[PDB]
Amino acid sequence: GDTKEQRILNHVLQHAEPGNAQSVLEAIDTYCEQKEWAMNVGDKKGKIVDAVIQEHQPSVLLELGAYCGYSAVRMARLLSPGARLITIEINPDCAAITQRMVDFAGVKDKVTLVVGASQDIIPQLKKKYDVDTLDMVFLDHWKDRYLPDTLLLEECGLLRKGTVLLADNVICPGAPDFLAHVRGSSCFECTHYQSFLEYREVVDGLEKAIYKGP
Ligand SMILES: Nc1ncnc2c1ncn2[C@@H]1O[C@H](C[C@@H](N)CC[C@H](N)C(=O)O)[C@@H](O)[C@H]1O
Ligand SMILES: O=[N+]([O-])c1cc(O)c(O)c([N+](=O)[O-])c1
Ligand SMILES: [Mg+2]
Fold it and tell me: Is residue 95 within 8 Å of residue 64, measured between CB atoms?
């Protein structure tokens, strides 16, 4: 008598340690491996996300698509006080799960969750969320929004030289229009990490695209 996202949260509440981000991630990944698949970036691709954050040291991050909060918890746990991870989530029930997950994980002081569609919120970031430019963007929402939101981020002046875009699922389910754009454009320098779809033995990959300036 509940939703899958509630079942994931409840599993965390009963199995993970309050305030322990590692333990929250482990409980989510265990539940989704063993009981019900869900579209979290997961532990194998999450290790690649962690390495990108360690390599580029962002302190202002934007996430597109929060779902149950797995990736927000994963990324926020690596950030130091004063860092900001702004996450945009269009589905208000998912947003409600994400806020509870972030709170339980102990990272709420680093996370600003915004309910709404990325295309509506992105142009408000500078004036309403006190953003200058972004250090890193994690794209993980509906894949047909990757390219339009990348273009919007650029038009809105949110990318500086050196901003890191990191996109999940560029192979499966796929983001070919986004890939063709960033790989063909002199405005980006791209790296591809081959990996696997979360919780499955199916090939996937992430693309890192560094903005070079207009
Ligand atoms: N235009 C959009 N703006 C914001 N969120 C969106 C949009 N389109 C889809 N979403 C949400 O994107 C999320 C997609 C998930 N794959 C996110 C997973 C999350 N990044 C994680 O790894 O834990 C869902 O919760 C969607 O409701
Ligand atoms: O269908 N899937 O396998 C996925 C996987 C994912 O990792 C997703 O992020 C996704 N989505 O946001 O639509 C869908
Ligand atoms: Mg994904």
Answer: no
The resolution, in angstroms to one decimal, equals 1.5
The CATH superfamily label for domain 1-214 reads: Vaccinia Virus protein VP39 (3.40.50.150)
Minimal CA–CA distance to 114: which of 85, 82, 71?
Answer: 85
State yes or no: is 140 an active-site residue.
Answer: yes
The ranges assigned to domains in the chain are 1-214
Report d(CA 69, CA 73) in Å as an integer: 6
Ligand 2 pocket test, pick from 36, 37, 39, 170 with the greatest ligand atom count within 8 Å of Cβ, gives 39
CB of 133 closer than 8 Å to CB of 162: no
Concerning whether 154 is annotated as a catalytic residue, the answer is no
Active site residue 149: no
C-alpha–C-alpha distance, residues 149 and 118, integer Å:
7
Residue 142 in tokens: 């509906």
**49 pocket-lining for ligand 1 (C-beta < 6 Å):** no
Long-range contacts of 149-155 (CB under 8 A, 24+ apart): 149/64, 149/118, 149/119, 149/122, 150/178, 150/181, 150/182, 152/119, 152/122, 152/123, 153/122, 154/187, 154/211, 154/214
DSSP 164-213: EEEES-IIIII-HHHHHHHHH-TTEEEEEEEEE-TTSSSEEEEEEEEE--
Rg (alpha carbons) of the chain, rounded to whole number: 16
- For ligand 1, mutation pick of 6, 37, 50, 64 (most atoms within 8 Å of CB): 64
